[PDB]
Design a protein around this ligand. Structure first.
Ligand SMILES: *[C@@H]1O[C@H](CO)[C@@H](O)[C@H](O)[C@H]1NC(C)=O
Ligand SMILES: *[C@@H]1O[C@H](CO)[C@@H](O)[C@H](O)[C@H]1NC(C)=O
Lengths: 13, 189, 178
């Protein structure tokens, strides 16, 4: 009953 | 305002074939409109699409816990969310509404268009055909294409270029996934 | 395929605008309001069967902003080429007089996702009962949007949707009359 999000990754600085 | 802009998009996509029997997960990243790095569930690792995204594929693929959570997304994310909204998305079916009325290409001249207005249906795939006295008319038919109203409905206007004569019966046939038989509407002068 | 569910996000500099939304087969399931931090379902019936935690969405926008500043340096500050939109005006249902209907202004195939659009009646602006969708993603990775205007068709009135975009050299007006 709850939608799950998918995670955005962080680029190397 | 004339300042330059810089856009960054991310698209987490789940692709489904035959229910959830086959699922594809894509983790795409864009600078403006150019994709530069993605994760493809059929490959199991990040791959750089342009030279610009090479630092990201190298850095992300070194992390074990990241690749593993990206490889389970077909089940932890794609198949999970499918069953959540399967009721009101996958199985949403709205009956079409067919109206037939005449129109004109240039004003102040007799009717020369038979417009079949199919309205408010879902899903989008539709097959609309014209008939004249029982014979299908495939010559001189123009349309708007399939229009997405943006509110989870579609519409299309399939127009017939013809000057109707008295005693002619024109029929607009509409086929749709949610229909058991072809829906037809007759129009006579 | 059979169906596609897309979780689309974007962040735009220097406007500092972001957006989080779910896409199904080209239709919007819901979007997270970045301001009030709330889930906005495209149709009220959706929120009954499904829930979404709006707090999780704001994390991706933070990473999106950080990524953008990394990519802007990488591209030596190469700005985005503005793509002007196509505009079309249609009615949701076939027109009858004194029978309620809805005008739809369809702004498609544009980037960046910034646009001024206005409904006009006989030349004067209208903001009564006007609704609009948030910026919807495409598959060529431009954008598209919808504006709605409930109205009563009459012989006396005339309607335009004027769209403004940095890729247009003049405000594009799209006409509708009965
Ligand atoms: C950006 O600048 C770097 C450093 O001068 C250079 O190597 C690169 O070719 C330039 N262009 C792009 C598209 O990265
Ligand atoms: C919206 O109107 C404001 C008025 O100053 C303008 O700065 C902005 O650029 C307009 N939208 C466009 C065409 O981007």
């Amino acid at each position: 009953e709850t939608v799950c999000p998918r995670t955005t990754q962080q680029s190397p600085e | 305002d004339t300042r330059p802009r810089f856009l960054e998009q991310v698209k987490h996509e789940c692709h489904f074939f035959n229910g959830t029997e086959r699922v594809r997960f894509l983790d795409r990243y864009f600078y403006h409109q150019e994709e530069y790095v993605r994760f493809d569930s059929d490959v199991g690792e990040y791959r750089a699409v342009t030279e610009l995204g090479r630092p990201d594929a190298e850095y992300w693929n070194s992390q074990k816990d990241l690749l593993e959570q990206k490889r389970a997304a077909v089940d932890t994310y794609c198949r999970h969310n499918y069953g959540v909204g399967e009721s009101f998305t996958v199985q949403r079916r709205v009956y079409p509404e067919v109206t037939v009325y005449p129109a004109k290409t240039q004003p102040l001249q007799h009717h020369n268009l038979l417009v079949c207005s199919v309205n408010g249906f879902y899903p989008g795939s539709i097959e609309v055909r014209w008939f004249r006295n029982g014979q299908e008319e495939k010559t001189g038919v123009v349309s708007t294409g399939l229009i997405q109203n943006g509110d989870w409905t579609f519409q299309t206007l399939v127009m017939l270029e013809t000057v109707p004569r008295s005693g002619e019966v024109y029929t607009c046939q509409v086929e749709h996934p949610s229909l058991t038989s072809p829906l037809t509407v007759e129009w006579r002068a | 395929e059979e169906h596609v569910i897309i979780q689309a996000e974007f962040y735009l500099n220097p406007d500092q605008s972001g957006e989080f939304m779910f896409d199904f087969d080209g239709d919007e399931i819901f979007h997270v309001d970045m301001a009030k931090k709330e889930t906005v379902w495209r149709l009220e019936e959706f929120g009954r069967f499904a829930s979404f935690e709006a707090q999780g969405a704001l994390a991706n926008i933070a990473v999106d902003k950080a990524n953008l500043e990394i990519m802007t340096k990488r591209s030596n500050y190469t700005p985005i080429t503005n793509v002007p939109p196509e505009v079309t005006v249609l009615t949701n249902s076939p027109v009858e007089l004194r029978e309620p209907n809805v005008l739809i202004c369809f702004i498609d195939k544009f980037t960046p996702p910034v646009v001024n659009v206005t409904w006009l009646r006989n030349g004067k602006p209208v903001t009564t009962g006007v609704s609009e969708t948030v910026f919807l993603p495409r598959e060529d990775h431009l954008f598209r949007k919808f504006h709605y205007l409930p109205f009563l068709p009459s012989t006396e009135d005339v309607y335009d949707c004027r769209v403004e975009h940095w890729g247009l050299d003049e405000p594009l007006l799209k006409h509708w009359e009965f």
